[PDB]
Design a binder for this molecule. Sequence first.
Ligand SMILES: NS(=O)(=O)c1cc(NC(=O)Nc2ccc(C(F)(F)F)cc2)c(O)c([N+](=O)[O-])c1
Ligand SMILES: [Zn+2]
Length: 257
Amino acid sequence: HWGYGKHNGPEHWHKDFPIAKGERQSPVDIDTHTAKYDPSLKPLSVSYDQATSLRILNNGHAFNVEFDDSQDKAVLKGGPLDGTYRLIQFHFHWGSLDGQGSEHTVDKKKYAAELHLVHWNTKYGDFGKAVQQPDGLAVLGIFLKVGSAKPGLQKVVDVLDSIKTKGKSADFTNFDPRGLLPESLDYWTYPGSLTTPPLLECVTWIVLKEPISVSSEQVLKFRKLNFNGEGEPEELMVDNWRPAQPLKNRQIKASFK
Ligand SMILES: NS(=O)(=O)c1cc(NC(=O)Nc2ccc(C(F)(F)F)cc2)c(O)c([N+](=O)[O-])c1
Ligand SMILES: [Zn+2]
């Protein structure tokens, strides 16, 4: 099946998922001079004080931290959104070197990694229903640059040894996702898609202007993970990012001037 290798990577995905060539695919390059300031955009409202993380999983493409979404515990609202979206998981995309790794780019600049906080629209009742709707998901995207260590990330870094290979999971309770946010919540927004198969075009993307810093050692630990399962030949989990797609008939809006 699909992956990020030479014979199954993003240039091949359209054969099994023809929407790979659709009208609102992600990620995109954010051209900061042609993005449009929109004064009618509201501030983001991030309410993560009651978040309940459950576990961390190596799913063979990235690693996911999953949360309890049976109730409105950790929600996102405001910004360009109408309604309440519940946090279900977060994951990252990263590179084999510091110069690449993010999925979105800013004026063609790539960052070392990108954090994706996935939320789904509660009016649709469950995540499976929400992904079938043009306004079903809202994903908060955060860039990582290499520099100073990010203290709030270290707990994630320390458990990666226990989920080295595909299909492994570990108990991961009491993790506070507020530790991953930058200082400012200024953002760009556009309508887009999932960036992995099935590539459904169900996402309101909210991409924060301000990156967070992580240390060289922290991102090094990311690139020790394994695409393969235990007992298979080792393939390091690196460069699990999809390249920028054509913007086509879309406009990037900015919350800031
Ligand atoms: N980069 S991203 O788009 O934000 C992104 C999304 C997911 N998760 C899913 O896509 N789940 C899912 C989607 C549809 C169905 C359905 F509807 F088919 F059942 C079932 C499950 C993910 O695991 C990663 N990742 O890399 O770990 C990245
Ligand atoms: Zn993602």
